Structure formats: structure tokens, C-alpha cells
Amino acid sequence: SNDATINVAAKHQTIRGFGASSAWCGALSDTCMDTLYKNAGLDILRVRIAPNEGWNRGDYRAWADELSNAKKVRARGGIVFATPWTPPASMKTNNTTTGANKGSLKPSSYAAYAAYLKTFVKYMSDNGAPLYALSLQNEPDWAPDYDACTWTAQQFHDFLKQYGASLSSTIKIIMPESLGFNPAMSDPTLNDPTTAQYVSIIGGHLYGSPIRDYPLARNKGKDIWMTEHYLEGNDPGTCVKLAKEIHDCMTIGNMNAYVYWWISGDQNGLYNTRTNETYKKTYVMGQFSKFIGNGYSRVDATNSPQSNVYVSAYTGNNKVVIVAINQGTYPVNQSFNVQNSTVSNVSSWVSSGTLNMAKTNSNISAANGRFNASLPAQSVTTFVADA
Amino acid sequence: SNDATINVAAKHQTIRGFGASSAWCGALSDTCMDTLYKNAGLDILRVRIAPNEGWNRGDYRAWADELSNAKKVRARGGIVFATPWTPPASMKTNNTTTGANKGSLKPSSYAAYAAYLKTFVKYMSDNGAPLYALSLQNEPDWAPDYDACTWTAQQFHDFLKQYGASLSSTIKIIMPESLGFNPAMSDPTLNDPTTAQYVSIIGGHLYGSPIRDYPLARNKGKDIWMTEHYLEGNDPGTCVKLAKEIHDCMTIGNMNAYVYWWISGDQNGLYNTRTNETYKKTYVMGQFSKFIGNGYSRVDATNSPQSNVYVSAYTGNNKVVIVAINQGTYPVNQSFNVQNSTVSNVSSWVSSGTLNMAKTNSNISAANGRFNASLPAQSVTTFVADA
Ligand SMILES: [Cl-]
Ligand SMILES: [Cl-]
Ligand SMILES: [Cl-]
Ligand SMILES: [Cl-]
Ligand SMILES: [Cl-]
Ligand SMILES: [Cl-]
Ligand SMILES: [Cl-]
Ligand SMILES: [Cl-]
Ligand SMILES: [Cl-]
Ligand SMILES: [Cl-]
Ligand SMILES: [Cl-]
Ligand SMILES: [Cl-]
Ligand SMILES: [Cl-]
Ligand SMILES: [Cl-]
Ligand SMILES: [Cl-]
Numbered sequence: 106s107n108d109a110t111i112n113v114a115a116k117h118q119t120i121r122g123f124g125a126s127s128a129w130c131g132a133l134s135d136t137c138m139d140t141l142y143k144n145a146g147l148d149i150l151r152v153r154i155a156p157n158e159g160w161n162r163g164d165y166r167a168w169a170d171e172l173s174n175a176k177k178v179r180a181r182g183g184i185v186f187a188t189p190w191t192p193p194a195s196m197k198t199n200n201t202t203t204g205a206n207k208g209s210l211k212p213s214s215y216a217a218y219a220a221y222l223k224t225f226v227k228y229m230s231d232n233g234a235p236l237y238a239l240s241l242q243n244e245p246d247w248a249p250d251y252d253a254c255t256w257t258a259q260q261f262h263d264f265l266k267q268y269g270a271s272l273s274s275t276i277k278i279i280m281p282e283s284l285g286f287n288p289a290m291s292d293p294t295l296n297d298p299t300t301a302q303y304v305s306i307i308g309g310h311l312y313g314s315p316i317r318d319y320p321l322a323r324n325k326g327k328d329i330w331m332t333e334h335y336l337e338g339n340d341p342g343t344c345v346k347l348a349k350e351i352h353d354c355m356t357i358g359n360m361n362a363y364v365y366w367w368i369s370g371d372q373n374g375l376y377n378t379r380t381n382e383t384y385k386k387t388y389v390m391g392q393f394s395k396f397i398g399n400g401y402s403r404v405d406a407t408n409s410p411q412s413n414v415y416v417s418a419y420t421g422n423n424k425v426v427i428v429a430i431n432q433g434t435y436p437v438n439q440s441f442n443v444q445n446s447t448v449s450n451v452s453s454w455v456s457s458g459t460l461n462m463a464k465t466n467s468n469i470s471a472a473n474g475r476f477n478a479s480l481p482a483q484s485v486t487t488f489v490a491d492a
Numbered sequence: 493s494n495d496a497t498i499n500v501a502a503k504h505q506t507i508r509g510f511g512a513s514s515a516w517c518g519a520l521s522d523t524c525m526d527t528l529y530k531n532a533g534l535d536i537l538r539v540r541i542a543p544n545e546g547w548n549r550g551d552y553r554a555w556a557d558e559l560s561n562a563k564k565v566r567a568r569g570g571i572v573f574a575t576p577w578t579p580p581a582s583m584k585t586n587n588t589t590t591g592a593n594k595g596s597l598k599p600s601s602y603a604a605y606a607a608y609l610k611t612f613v614k615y616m617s618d619n620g621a622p623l624y625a626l627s628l629q630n631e632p633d634w635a636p637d638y639d640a641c642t643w644t645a646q647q648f649h650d651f652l653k654q655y656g657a658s659l660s661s662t663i664k665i666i667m668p669e670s671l672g673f674n675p676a677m678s679d680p681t682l683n684d685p686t687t688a689q690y691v692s693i694i695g696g697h698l699y700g701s702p703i704r705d706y707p708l709a710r711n712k713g714k715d716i717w718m719t720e721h722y723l724e725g726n727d728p729g730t731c732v733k734l735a736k737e738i739h740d741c742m743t744i745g746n747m748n749a750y751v752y753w754w755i756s757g758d759q760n761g762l763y764n765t766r767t768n769e770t771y772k773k774t775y776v777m778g779q780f781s782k783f784i785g786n787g788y789s790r791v792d793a794t795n796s797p798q799s800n801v802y803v804s805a806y807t808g809n810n811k812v813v814i815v816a817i818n819q820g821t822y823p824v825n826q827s828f829n830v831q832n833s834t835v836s837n838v839s840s841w842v843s844s845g846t847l848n849m850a851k852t853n854s855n856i857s858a859a860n861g862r863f864n865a866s867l868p869a870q871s872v873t874t875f876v877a878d879a
């Protein structure tokens with residue numbers, strides 16, 4: 106009864122990875138970076154481009170902490186993308202780095218902003234931490250009193266038709282990083298082939314709006330990345346909520362990558378640099394990232410085989426990986442049936458209120474692709490098998 | 493609130509170990525023995541002395557399978573004791589090896605039975621698997637239709653006043669292995685100093701009667717060993733029932749050792765030799781045996797700090813070990829406070845419906861002897877710390 110059926114023959118999106126941001130986290134330590142990027146297996150880092158007035162006279166001091174973070178992640182096998190929260194104040198209609206009075210990028214500074222971003226990309230490259238991609242703006246639809254800069258959907262179109270060729274010849278471009286992943290923010294760019302061609306990755310955040318598929322983006326060949334979100338708490342209930350959010354991004358959103366908010370900026374991050382302690386949300390992320398390898402594809406799996414259980418699955422390099430979330434307050438047994446592959450050597454790891462990415466030592470045997478297992482209360486289990 | 497307080501200064505009995513029996517299990521494989529005696533860390537083996545009519549003409553064939561079992565356990569760091577379920581039929585009042593018509597040992601064969609047991613002890617020694625102790629009889633108060641032999645409390649006294657000197661000069665003696673650990677079966681032997689002196693270990697089983705302390709035995713200097721019991725099932729509820737039984741033997745019974753019934757004789761054992769699979773009761777035993785070392789003493793700990801949680805603790809070799817059982821259906825948090833020791837480097841391992849003696853990777857910090865942890869539903873956790 107109510108099997109989780111996994112069909113390795115039905116493939117979905119390619120998984121780029123999972124990560125977090127170093128924005129406003131200073132220069133993170135080797136221990137923090139080892140914890141996250143080696144042990145938990147995160148492999149994407151989002152750095153901030155701090156507003157830098159000296160950019161065009163060779164003064165990069167404002168950027169050196171992120172350089173350091175970038176190098177540490179690259180040394181640990183990760184890729185790095187950059188997000189600017191604002192152009193320098195000299196380019197803003199409000200004459201400040203904040204979002205005061207819905208400040209925006211002066212159209213008379215469009216060429217300079219393009220040059221600015223290219224200067225950051227070349228800085229990072231010249232110092233041995235080349236970027237994988239670059240975003241045009243954080244949350245163009247939010248105007249708070251910290252680094253911010255408004256853009257309308259038409260402004261992104263305006264900008265890209267002029268400067269997208271130059272920018273994309275330099276680096277993969279992410280846009281638009283909407284507050285709530287509003288497709289209207291990017292639709293004008295995607296629907297005009299002149300502008301769509303300059304975009305590689307469609308990025309968005311999950312504040313306020315449910316997770317959704319984005320068919321236009323996928324059908325234009327774009328990656329879809331969830332580039333910022335956080336949750337408050339590290340109790341088991343919050344941890345399984347995070348797990349279900351990642352699962353929903355993978356499954357409903359068809360997203361190629363999931364990127365948590367900041368590593369250490371406050372108590373809602375992944376690592377506490379004041380006590381040198383790992384927040385338990387870290388291990389939720391690890392149940393995906395440590396086990397899902399390079400170039401893996403998501404495949405069909407019964408999304409919810411019984412109440413409060415959620416399942417997704419991935420294949421690559423002759424492995425099958427199954428992530429099974431139990432949001433219930435008690436353990437439950439769950440059967441799995443892998444189709445169109447011959448599976449062996451099943452091993453599992455659990456993160457829960459007690460366990461941190463702990464190998465279970467369970468003695469799982471598979472016959473004709475079927476095995477079963479007990480899922481602890483408020484837990485995430487990852488099965489890895491030969492396939 | 494409701495701490496489990498551990499006081500290393502208040503010491504109780506010395507722990508000899510934990511084990512199981514190879515009676516009627518044939519000659520067990522290396523894989524079975526590795527599973528139990530290396531990985532789970534059992535370290536006591538109870539062999540049966542099969543009734544052997546050829547004992548006095550050098551025919552030991554009936555004993556060779558147990559010889560093999562004994563050698564395997566000794567090679568894996570364990571000790572071995574032997575239990576006879578019956579003398580040979582030639583010494584029985586019913587002329588058979590069974591318990592038919594409450595058959596007993598003929599008083600005219602007392603000297604021969606003593607010689608018989610000494611022949612088994614010397615056999616085992618001569619072939620490189622010397623025994624640690626020897627029992628006079630299995631379940632002298634039960635007379636079933638398999639190997640059996642009745643003895644009254646006065647018969648044990650009768651026998652020991654004559655043959656105990658000879659027998660005890662050869663080997664540590666266990667008696668009386670009552671069905672339900674009835675102290676009346678051994679009281680006459682213990683209360684006469686002439687007979688008490690020949691006994692080293694008071695052994696008993698747990699069929700039908702609650703676990704109890706045995707002050708007379710402890711006050712005469714004797715070890716108290718639970719030498720046979722089993723439970724039916726391997727579900728989490730049964731596994732925590734077994735854990736609580738061991739805990740009760742340690743705590744209420746002040747027992748030095750706990751010995752499960754047979755390893756592989758039927759489905760109620762610890763290992764299935766037909767499928768080469770380990771029954772989950774094995775891991776319950778391992779949560780005690782693998783972690784509680786040579787010469788450790790039990791110490792004071794809050795027996796039940798909250799409902800359905802049971803705690804015991806042990807020290808030795810500058811370690812403290814804490815076994816915490818959660819019989820509840822949901823996880824609970826539990827605080828621990830170690831007194832009169834300075835503890836560091838706390839690590840934990842869990843056995844549950846999902847986990848088999850699995851290291852948790854939890855990041856437990858202790859300050860002034862206090863730490864806390866989440867105990868999964870229907871689980872056994874063992875903490876080990878430097879002390
Ligand atoms: Cl894809
Ligand atoms: Cl900073
Ligand atoms: Cl650096
Ligand atoms: Cl506003
Ligand atoms: Cl617009
Ligand atoms: Cl549009
Ligand atoms: Cl939240
Ligand atoms: Cl930690
Ligand atoms: Cl935490
Ligand atoms: Cl298999
Ligand atoms: Cl495993
Ligand atoms: Cl198992
Ligand atoms: Cl003792
Ligand atoms: Cl046998
Ligand atoms: Cl042998």
C-alpha cells in the first residue's frame with residue numbers, strides 16, 4: 106500500500122546545487138566554510154557586491170571580504186554568483202545606497218552600471234575566484250532602508266536591450282530576483298527574443314508568494330534558481346518546513362538550484378560565528394546537497410505517498426538518490442519502488458531533532474527495486490543506491 | 493526541570509558483560525560471531541553441555557559444536573560459561589534426558605555427575621577454550637520434554653556439601669538458574685557457610701516473576717547474573733521493552749551480567765542464520781555492551797526522570813557512560829547532570845526503528861556536567877564522555 110514509486114526513466118531538470126550567501130557576513134573563517142562547503146556539501150555561494158565608489162580608480166577594498174569568501178568556496182569545490190543590492194549612490198536617483206523614495210538606477214548611468222558590474226566580474230577573475238554568474242539586482246520590487254534599488258519590468262528590458270550583449274559576453278546573467286518570484290518582473294525580458302537571449306538564469310526569492318512553476322523560463326531554455334529565502338527557528342518542525350520548501354522548489358518549481366539567505370548575519374542563518382555552532386537547518390540542506398551529485402537529474406517520484414510524507418529523487422553517475430521527508434510527529438514506515446533500474450547497496454542518512462546527517466547503519470535490502478524503511482518523526486532521510 | 497542526575501561518586505556493582513547462548517545453535521559462523529561479538533560488542537557466551545554418554549571413554553563428539561562456538565567468542569574477546577540442561581540418561585531417575593515425570597539426578601550418581609562436569613571443563617581447557625564458569629543445572633524448577641533435570645533447593649545443598657569443594661577447586665560455580673529467579677532455590681545453599689563458599693555466581697532466569705534485588709547473594713559476595721531470557725518480536729516497542737528489562741536488571745536487580753537466550757535457534761533469537769540477518773534486539777544489547785567497558789561500575793542516576801524515560805550510568809577508565817531509554821511514542825528532550833566529575837567530549841549513539849547503533853553526530857557540549865539531548869521515540873541512546 107501507498108508506495109513511493111520512483112521512475113528513473115522519467116527525467117526532469119538538471120541540479121546545479123544548493124548554497125547560501127555570504128552577504129554582510131564579513132570574511133568567513135575556514136572552519137565555517139569547511140562546515141558548510143565540505144561536511145554539509147553545499148556548493149553554491151552568493152556574494153554581495155558592496156556599493157563601491159572607487160570602482161573606476163582601482164580601489165577594491167569594499168569587495169575584498171567577498172573575494173575571500175569566494176576563494177574559500179572555490180577551494181572547497183563550489184561555484185560563486187554575485188548579487189548587487191544597489192549601484193553606487195552616484196548612479197541612484199535618490200543619491201543614496203538605500204531604497205529611500207523608491208530610488209532607482211538613473212537611466213543616464215546605464216552604461217556606467219554595466220561597466221561597474223564588468224569591473225566586479227574582472228576583479229574576481231583577476232584575483233583567482235572567477236564567478237559563475239552575475240545578477241542585475243536584488244529584489245527590484247522592494248525598497249527598504251538598507252542597500253536597495255528599484256527596477257520595473259520595463260527598465261530591465263530597457264537596460265538589457267542596450268547592455269545585455271556586453272554583459273552576457275562577459276558572464277552568465279541572473280535576473281530579476283523578485284521578492285516573491287513574480288514572473289511579471291521577467292516576462293517582458295523573456296518574451297522579447299532580443300532581451301531573452303542575454304539571460305541565462307531566472308532567479309527569484311520566496312517572500313510572500315507560494316512556490317510555482319515558471320513554464321516560460323524553462324521553455325526558453327533558462328535555469329530557474331531560488332536565490333534567497335530564510336526561515337526563523339531550528340526546531341524539528343522548522344527544519345522539516347525548510348525541507349518541504351526545498352522539495353517544493355525541486356518538484357513544483359522545477360528549479361535547478363536552491364540558495365539559502367545569509368550564513369552568519371544573524372540568528373536566522375546557518376552558522377553562528379560567535380559560538381562556532383552549526384544551526385540545524387544546515388543539515389536539512391545537506392540531506393540534498395551532500396548526496397545529489399554533479400549533473401544529476403531529478404526524476405519522477407510519488408510526491409506525497411502518505412500524509413505528511415514527501416518524496417523526490419535524482420539520478421546520475423549510476424546512482425539513485427531519494428530524499429524522503431516525514432513532517433509527522435511520530436515515525437512511519439514507507440515503501441519505495443524504483444522502476445526502470447536495478448538498484449543495489451542502499452544506504453541511508455537521517456537528519457532530525459537528534460541526528461545530524463547520520464548514517465543509519467540500517468540493513469536495507471532491495472529486490473526488484475523495492476525496499477522499505479522507517480522514517481523518524483520530523484525528519485529527512487536520504488537513500489543512496491547503486492543504479 | 494526533571495533532570496537525570498548522575499553521581500559518579502556513588503558506585504554500585506561491577507559489570508561483567510552482556511551476552512547470549514549458543515545452546516542448540518549448531519556451530520555458528522564467523523559472520524554471526526563477528527556481528528554479535530565484535531560489532532555489537534557482546535562478550536559473554538553461554539554454551540550448553542549436551543548429554544554425552546561417551547564422556548568417560550574419551551568420546552567428546554557431542555561437545556564439539558560448543559567447543560567451536562567457545563573458541564570463536566574467546567577470539568573475539570569474550571568469556572564463556574557452560575550450562576547443562578541434563579546429566580546423561582544413565583544418571584537420571586527417569587532413565588531419559590528429558591524432564592519426564594519430574595526426573596532428577598540419582599543420588600547414587602552424585603559423584604559421577606561431579607566427575608562428568610569436571611570432564612567437560614577439562615575438555616574445553618585442553619582444546620584451547622577454557623571456561624570462565626560452570627552452572628550445575630538449567631531451570632531445576634521446570635521439567636519439560638526436552639533436556640531437563642529437577643533439583644530441589646535441598647538437593648543442591650546435599651550435592652554441594654559433598655562435591656562443591658572438588659567442583660569449585662576446578663571452576664567458578666553458577667547456581668541455581670531458577671525459572672523465575674526464585675531466591676528460595678538458592679537460600680539454603682547461601683545460608684549454610686559450608687555450601688555458600690563453593691558458589692561464585694548466583695544465576696537466574698526471568699520467566700514469570702518480576703525482577704527483584706537479591707540482598708543475601710550480594711551480601712555473601714556473590715555475582716548475580718541473569719543467565720537466560722527472551723522476548724517475542726523486533727518492533728520498536730519490543731526493543732524498548734528489552735532495553736527496560738536490561739535496565740531493570742542493572743538497577744533493581746543490581747546484576748553484574750545479562751545473558752539473552754539463544755542466538756539463532758528460532759525466530760526469537762538475535763541472528764537469523766538462514767537469511768544472515770541481524771534481529772533488531774541485537775542492537776538494544778549493543779547499546780549497553782559495546783560502550784560499557786572492562787571493570788566498569790554502575791553509578792547513581794535518576795532511574796526515571798520523566799515518564800517513559802529510563803536512565804542508568806556506568807564509569808570506568810576515565811569514562812562515563814549513560815544509557816537513556818525513551819519508551820514513548822514521540823521524541824522528548826532530556827537534561828543530564830553529571831555530579832562529582834568533570835565531563836568532556838560527549839558523543840552519542842542511537843538504536844531505534846530506523847537506527848542501528850548509529851553515531852548521531854550531535855554536537856553536544858557539556859558545562860559543569862550538564863548537557864541535554866533529544867531522545868527519539870522508542871529508542872535507546874548511549875552517551876559516552878571523558879570523565
Ligand atoms: Cl535542466
Ligand atoms: Cl560585511
Ligand atoms: Cl583573500
Ligand atoms: Cl517602498
Ligand atoms: Cl513595468
Ligand atoms: Cl510580457
Ligand atoms: Cl519563518
Ligand atoms: Cl554545533
Ligand atoms: Cl540549532
Ligand atoms: Cl540490495
Ligand atoms: Cl545505511
Ligand atoms: Cl535494519
Ligand atoms: Cl560487584
Ligand atoms: Cl545443535
Ligand atoms: Cl573447532
Ligand SMILES: [Cl-]
Nearest residue numbers: 594634635636
Ligand atoms: Cl512438571
Ligand SMILES: [Cl-]
Nearest residue numbers: 644645646647
Ligand atoms: Cl527443598
Ligand SMILES: [Cl-]
Nearest residue numbers: 679680681683
Ligand atoms: Cl534457607
Ligand SMILES: [Cl-]
Nearest residue numbers: 722723724725
Ligand atoms: Cl514477549
Ligand SMILES: [Cl-]
Nearest residue numbers: 468768769770
Ligand atoms: Cl540485517
Ligand SMILES: [Cl-]
Nearest residue numbers: 726770771772
Ligand atoms: Cl528485526
Ligand SMILES: [Cl-]
Nearest residue numbers: 836837857858
Ligand atoms: Cl564538552
Ligand SMILES: [Cl-]
Nearest residue numbers: 839840853854
Ligand atoms: Cl555524537
Ligand SMILES: [Cl-]
Nearest residue numbers: 461854855856
Ligand atoms: Cl546538534
Ligand SMILES: [Cl-]
Nearest residue numbers: 481482868869
Ligand atoms: Cl523519532
Ligand code: NA
Nearest residue numbers: 121122148399
Ligand atoms: Na553542484
Ligand code: NA
Nearest residue numbers: 122147148182
Ligand atoms: Na558539489
Ligand code: NA
Nearest residue numbers: 204205206248
Ligand atoms: Na521607504
Ligand code: NA
Nearest residue numbers: 244310312333
Ligand atoms: Na530579501
Ligand code: NA
Nearest residue numbers: 204248249250
Ligand atoms: Na519601508
Ligand code: NA
Nearest residue numbers: 394395397398
Ligand atoms: Na552535491
